[PDB]
Amino acid sequence: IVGGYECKAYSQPHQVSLNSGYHFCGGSLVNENWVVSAAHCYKSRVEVRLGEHNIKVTEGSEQFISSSRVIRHPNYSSYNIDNDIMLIKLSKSATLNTYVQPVALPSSCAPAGTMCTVSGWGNTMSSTADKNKLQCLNIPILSYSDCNNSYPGMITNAMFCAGYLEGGKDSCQGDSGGPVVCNGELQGVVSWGYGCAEPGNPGVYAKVCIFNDWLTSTMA
Ligand SMILES: [Ca+2]
DSSP, X not given: OXXXXXXXXXXXXXXXXXXXXXXXXXXXXXXXXXXEEOGGGXXXXXXXXXXXXXXXXXXXXXXXXXXXXXXXXXXXXXTTTBTOXXXXXXXXXXXXXXXXXXXXXXXXXXXXXXXXXXXXXSOOOOSSSOTTBOEEEEEEBOOHHHHHHHSTTTOOTTEEEESOTTOSOBOOTTTTTOEEEETTEEEEEEEEOSSSSOTTOOEEEEEGGXXXXXXXXXTO
16 A cells, blocks of 8 residues: 555454465455455465454464465456456354454445545555555545546456546555455455556556355355
């Protein structure tokens, strides 16, 4: 996260860290058994770390659970990152408490201008922002017009842009797979963008609201 602020500890209880030796992607707990992330973060097996704030220090609130199944969206394409969404099933159900809570799936697609929160342990591109502590940032959803204007012919129905064309505030590598929450619902998944926080290059996110059927069917 670039240009944000440190999240208050445990203020984003749905935020998870996908670990394979080290943190490599974020994710969102949607229920006691499933986690949503980005398809490009795929690995046959991964360790989901919940209840984290500082990923390098044991705080006593963490729950480390290995995956039992990792399912990429059937239409995911590594050529253009289309349909960049994935589901991870926990081998054992997560214990919901003060530090671990699921985020609700969208009941409708959020319109442009809606304010959201994006968080993660990715690159901060700062000397004062410690990436080991969960970082937070508020970003508005952009119109398709602005999105396509920034990335001509690269935006599909499964993508949306969020952030500021002015630059300076944006998600970045390491935040990938993480949540974009607006009005208490998971509207996006950190996917891609040109550089980070660069003017004219907003962040691109997987449009969760059009995957409700696949998500609910797969979680059955
Ligand atoms: Ca920790």
